[PDB]
């Protein structure tokens, strides 16, 4: 068994995972290899390479992927949208009145004919 | 001024064990870098 495979398995075990599947650590190692290769190539094309080139390459890469993670207060997680824009959209939506329903239609009405699966056979 | 965990851990070389143990000296997560983001957004 290679090195850092035992370390990744120990890290997973120390976080609640009671069982694994043999091949996960290999996947993670190959992913790390590919990420390192991509970032290195980008930095080499940017500019011997300094730390500024590496930082610029990472910043450029962050523009179209890795928009996730467990970020909290003002952390770019769950898509990366800003809370003010979402609040504006929520204010716009939550301004309309709730639909009017009668007891004879409570549970039997459906959307218009344009938004239902009618005649798909 | 629980048994097999010991075997799994001791399978590692002492150098790797020391490297893992050195994590405890990290200065936790002040996340003070968020100050600039908050200032920009405020």
């Amino acid at each position: 068994r290679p090195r850092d495979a035992r370390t990744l398995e120990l890290l997973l075990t120390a976080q609640g995972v009671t069982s694994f599947e043999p091949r996960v650590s290999q996947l993670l190692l190959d992913f790390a290899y590919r990420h390192t290769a991509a970032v290195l190539s980008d930095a080499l094309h940017l500019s011997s390479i300094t730390a500024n080139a590496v930082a610029l390459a990472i910043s450029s890469r962050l523009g179209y992927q890795f928009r996730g993670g467990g970020g909290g207060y003002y952390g770019g997680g769950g898509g990366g949208a800003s809370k003010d824009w979402m609040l504006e959209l929520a204010r716009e939506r939550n301004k309309v009145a709730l639909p009017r329903v009668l007891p004879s239609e409570w549970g039997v009405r459906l959307p218009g004919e344009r938004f239902v699966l009618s005649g798909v056979s | 001024v629980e048994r097999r965990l010991k075997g799994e851990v001791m399978q590692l070389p002492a150098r790797d064990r020391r490297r893992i143990k050195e994590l405890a000296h990290n200065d936790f997560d002040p996340y003070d870098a968020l100050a600039n983001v908050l200032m920009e957004h405020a």
Binding site: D84, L87, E88, R91 | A35, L38, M39, H41, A42
Partner: peptide
């Protein structure tokens, strides 16, 4: 000139802004 008196009600954005400003105001 004609005179008027009106009242402006609070919103959730106002509370969000208040907390955000308090977060970055030194003591």
């Amino acid at each position: 000139p004609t005179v008027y008196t009106v009242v402006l009600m609070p919103t959730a954005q106002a509370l969000h802004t208040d907390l955000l400003l308090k977060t970055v105001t030194p003591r």
